[PDB]
């Protein structure tokens, strides 16, 4: 199975534009360079398909990639269902994802009129209407912001790379 194409991928998505790679016909394997390896519904089997979801967030937002969490990531960027069967894997990526002047390129959604439903993706760049006045693309705010990752920030504010495997109903 081409799990290598997902874990060892040179470029990762912004969490708001999280990347999904469909895995179909092949076999899985085993995985000390990961700070988080948490499975839900199974434990370290065969399945119809495997989905590999991958993106970058802050270290202290990794708690939010789990069933029934809240926060700007779980609510407005990447939502897991309460009944989720799959594994959540993260690791510190300060070496690849932080830059001297601040890395702008990794963005998150800060504002949204309601919560995402589980596994929903929203790539919208449309101005968020907070107040009564409709917004002429200028109480009118841009909904995406940058993490600006810097190599010197504390572990909590460093970029972590996350891979979510979903198993729907490939053999281990």
């Amino acid at each position: 199975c081409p799990f290598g194409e997902v874990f060892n991928a040179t470029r990762f998505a912004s969490v708001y534009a999280w990347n999904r790679k469909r895995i179909s016909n092949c076999v899985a394997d085993y995985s000390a360079s990961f700070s988080t390896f948490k499975c839900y519904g199974v434990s370290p089997l065969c399945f119809t398909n495997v989905y590999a979801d991958s993106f970058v967030i802050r270290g202290d937002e990794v708690r939010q990639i789990a069933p029934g969490q809240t926060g700007n990531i779980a609510d407005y960027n990447y939502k897991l269902p309460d009944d989720f069967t799959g594994c959540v894997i993260a690791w510190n990526s300060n070496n690849l994802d932080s830059k001297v002047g601040g890395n702008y390129n990794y963005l998150y959604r800060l504002f949204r009129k309601s919560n995402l439903k589980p596994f929903e993706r929203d790539i919208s760049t449309e101005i968020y209407q907070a107040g009564s006045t409709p917004c002429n693309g200028v109480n009118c705010y841009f909904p995406l912001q940058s993490y600006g990752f810097q190599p010197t920030y504390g572990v909590g504010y460093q970029p972590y790379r996350v891979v979510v495997l979903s198993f729907e109903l490939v053999c281990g």
Epitope: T10, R11, S33, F34, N94, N95, L96, K99, N105, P151
Partner: antibody
Framework: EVQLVQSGAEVKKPGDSLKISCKGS????????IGWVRQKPGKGLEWMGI????????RYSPSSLGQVSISVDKSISTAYLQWSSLKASDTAMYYC??????????????????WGQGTLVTVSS | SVLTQPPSVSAAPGQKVTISCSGS????????VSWYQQLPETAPKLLIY???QRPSGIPDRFSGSKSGTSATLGITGLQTGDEADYYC???????????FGTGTKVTVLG
């Protein structure tokens, strides 16, 4: 075989603009970070920075940020290092080097593997 | 932030030399160390990667190790062709930059 073929020797005066070239063959140019190292006559290697050909994302060293600018033309598999105003102190050999990602998860780092033959830049008034 | 190497080492053909590379917890302490060989008037060449791995074509006379914040290159059965500048390197996590050591001149004593 991976090959990194660099532009020819450059003779310039202070205040001149200069763009040097490095073309990658024998691999998918687009999928690999590539960057620049400086060696002044009889001195150590000085890492300057790297670029991801796909989307021109960059990493500069403290010393090299703002001084110099790295760019790419993904279609001709070519990486570029560019000054708008050369100083005499920019006289050096400049090597391009491919930076595959070595290691795995938290041990992942950008890492020089293959080097070009070098480009001598001689800046005298 | 500097990876410090001895400026120069020498020995007779057939002897062993070691080249130390001392850094900090932001560089050698956390990250994979590489070594680069630069023969007079040539481009550097990767000699060692991931602390102790040899690229295809690099003889097992060349060995690498890392312990704490210092790495070491050993060259056994020193040969004329080994006379070169050697540089360690790694990524400095705190700097967000690759760093090369100060470099060592190996002399094969004739």
């Amino acid at each position: 075989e991976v090959q990194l073929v660099q532009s020819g020797a450059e003779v310039k005066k202070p205040g001149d603009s200069l763009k040097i070239s490095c073309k990658g063959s024998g691999y998918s140019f687009a999928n690999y970070w590539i960057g620049w190292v400086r060696q002044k006559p009889g001195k150590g290697l000085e890492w300057m920075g790297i670029i991801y050909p796909g989307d021109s994302d960059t990493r500069y060293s403290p010393s090299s940020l703002g001084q110099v600018s790295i760019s790419v033309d993904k279609s001709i598999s070519t990486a570029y290092l560019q000054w708008s105003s050369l100083k005499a102190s920019d006289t050096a050999m400049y090597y391009c080097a491919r930076h595959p990602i070595h290691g795995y998860g938290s041990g992942s780092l950008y890492n020089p593997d293959y080097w070009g033959q070098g480009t001598l830049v001689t800046v005298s008034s | 932030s500097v990876l410090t190497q001895p400026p120069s080492v020498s020995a007779a053909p057939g002897q062993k030399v070691t080249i130390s590379c001392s850094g900090s917890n932001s560089n050698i302490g956390i990250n994979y160390v590489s070594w680069y060989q630069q023969l007079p008037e040539t481009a550097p060449k990767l000699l060692i990667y991931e602390n102790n791995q040899r690229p295809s074509g690099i003889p097992d006379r060349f060995s690498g190790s890392k312990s704490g914040t210092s790495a070491t290159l050993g060259i056994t059965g020193l040969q004329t062709g080994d006379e070169a500048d050697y540089y360690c390197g790694t990524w400095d996590t705190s700097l967000g930059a690759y760093v090369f050591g100060t470099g060592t001149k190996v002399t094969v004593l004739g």
